[PDB]
């Protein structure tokens, strides 16, 4: 009568990590276990009717670890399914960045990106993206005029852009977080568009 869990997938953004599965249960409950690949299993979500489990508190302890998960099925030898392997540092989606400020400095514009807070905690400090990634983190800018003749591109190792602009022209700005050294999930989603005179 019990159905084993399937399509086990990690949903992770800025280290906020949720495991998800199928199916939506009928007369059954689930227990989720998590372990580091070498270490021991630990149960987190107990006899739940939910098809998801928040595992952030476990993964924030060591973000440079490979994690495994399994979901057991019980009615309301036990049936189970293993998840794909998950290494948070390499695989977590970079969240939506925000343009902090844009200022007109002479014949140039300075655009600054917010140093986005994550859920990773060291004592009484909630780590920013720069804190976690360091040199690995890079930002890309898209900038265009009122009459869009193709979107131009800029890159920075820091959180600041210095771009050559034309006088009187109102520009619109969009920013993106990039970890070039990743296999997967290298680029974040686009920042909200910030325009000169808005």
């Amino acid at each position, epitope marked *: 009568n019990t159905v084993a869990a399937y399509n086990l997938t990690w949903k992770s953004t800025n280290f906020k990590t949720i495991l998800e599965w199928e199916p939506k249960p009928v007369n059954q409950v689930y227990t989720v276990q998590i372990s580091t690949k070498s270490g021991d299993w630990k149960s987190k979500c107990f006899y739940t009717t939910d098809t998801e489990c928040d595992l952030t508190d476990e993964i924030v302890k060591d973000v*440079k*670890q*490979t994690y495994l998960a399994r979901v057991f099925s019980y009615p309301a030898e036990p049936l189970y399914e293993n998840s794909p392997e998950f*290494t948070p540092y390499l695989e977590t989606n970079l969240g939506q960045p925000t343009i902090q400020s844009f200022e007109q400095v002479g014949t140039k514009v300075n655009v600054t990106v917010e*140093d986005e807070r994550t859920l990773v905690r060291r004592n009484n400090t909630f*780590l920013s993206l720069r*804190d976690v*990634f360091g040199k690995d*983190l890079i930002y890309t800018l898209y900038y265009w005029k009122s009459s869009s003749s193709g979107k131009k591109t800029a890159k920075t190792n*820091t959180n600041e852009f210095l771009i050559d602009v034309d006088k009187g022209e109102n520009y619109c700005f969009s920013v993106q977080a990039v970890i070039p050294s990743r296999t997967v999930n290298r680029k974040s989603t686009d920042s909200p568009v910030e325009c000169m005179g808005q």
Partner: antibody
Framework: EVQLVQSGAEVKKPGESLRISCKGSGYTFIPYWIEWVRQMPGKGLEWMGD????????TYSPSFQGHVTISADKSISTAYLQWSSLKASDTAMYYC?????????????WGQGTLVTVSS | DIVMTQTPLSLPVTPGEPASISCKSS????????????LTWYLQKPGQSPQLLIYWASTRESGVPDRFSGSGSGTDFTLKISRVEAEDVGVYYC?????????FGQGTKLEIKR
């Protein structure tokens, strides 16, 4: 504990190819950068380059680009440094190092070193 | 390339008294977003591999005694040892840990004065 084990000492003629290795254990191999550092007899430290074993992505120092290749085999937790043809001035100690846990937190763990002798 | 300059080149210290090594960078090592100075200190003892001592200019790696301390901002940085013993001898290196390519100083030899 975290251990970096490098391959044994090498004695080579000029113009010969060489590959030296650095095996990592006691940690998850893929999300940590492996660094290569040259130290010539009685001299300072020179950063040669690095590799992220999870992808194979490499950065090189402008001084070392084209002279060396850095690679990794993540299934056996091993990184590599190799030459096409060695010069006599390649006679040095070579260290592999692993990066720290937090961003830009230095090279936290070092291997014992590989002495490379290039002579006629 | 960010050039790292160390003064002095050699430092004789009597047992029990303080030691001060200075590192200067040609470019700023301060990151504006998180207000962190990306300087790293190392110790290489005779016949040994380098050891990590301090990162983020002033944060100690676990295992490193509290007698080691870093300070400074932007371009000027300092490593202080409060009470020098025999096992503290060797060459001290600062490192640009801010931007590629990664660069080391020449090194400061610390020896016991007698």
């Amino acid at each position: 504990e975290v251990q970096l084990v490098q391959s044994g000492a090498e004695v080579k003629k000029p113009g010969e190819s060489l590959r030296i290795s650095c095996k990592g254990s006691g940690y998850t191999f893929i999300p940590y950068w492996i660094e290569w550092v040259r130290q010539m007899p009685g001299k300072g430290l020179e950063w040669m380059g690095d590799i992220l074993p999870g992808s194979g992505f490499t950065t090189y120092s402008p001084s070392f680009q084209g002279h060396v290749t850095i690679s990794a085999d993540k299934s056996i937790s091993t990184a590599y440094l190799q030459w096409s043809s060695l010069k006599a001035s390649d006679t040095a100690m070579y260290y592999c190092a692993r990066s720290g846990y937090y961003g830009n937190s230095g090279f936290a763990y070092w291997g014992q070193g590989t002495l490379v002798t290039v002579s006629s | 390339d960010i050039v790292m300059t160390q003064t002095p080149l050699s430092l004789p210290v009597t047992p029990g008294e303080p030691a001060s090594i200075s590192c200067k960078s040609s470019q700023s090592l301060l990151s504006s977003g998180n207000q962190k100075n990306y300087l790293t200190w190392y110790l290489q003892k005779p016949g040994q591999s380098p050891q990590l001592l301090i990162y983020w200019a002033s944060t100690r790696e676990s295992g490193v005694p509290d007698r080691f301390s870093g300070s400074g901002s932007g371009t000027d940085f300092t490593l202080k040892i409060s009470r020098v013993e025999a096992e503290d001898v060797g060459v001290y290196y600062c490192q640009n840990d801010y931007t590629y390519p990664l660069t080391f100083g020449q090194g400061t030899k610390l020896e016991i004065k007698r």
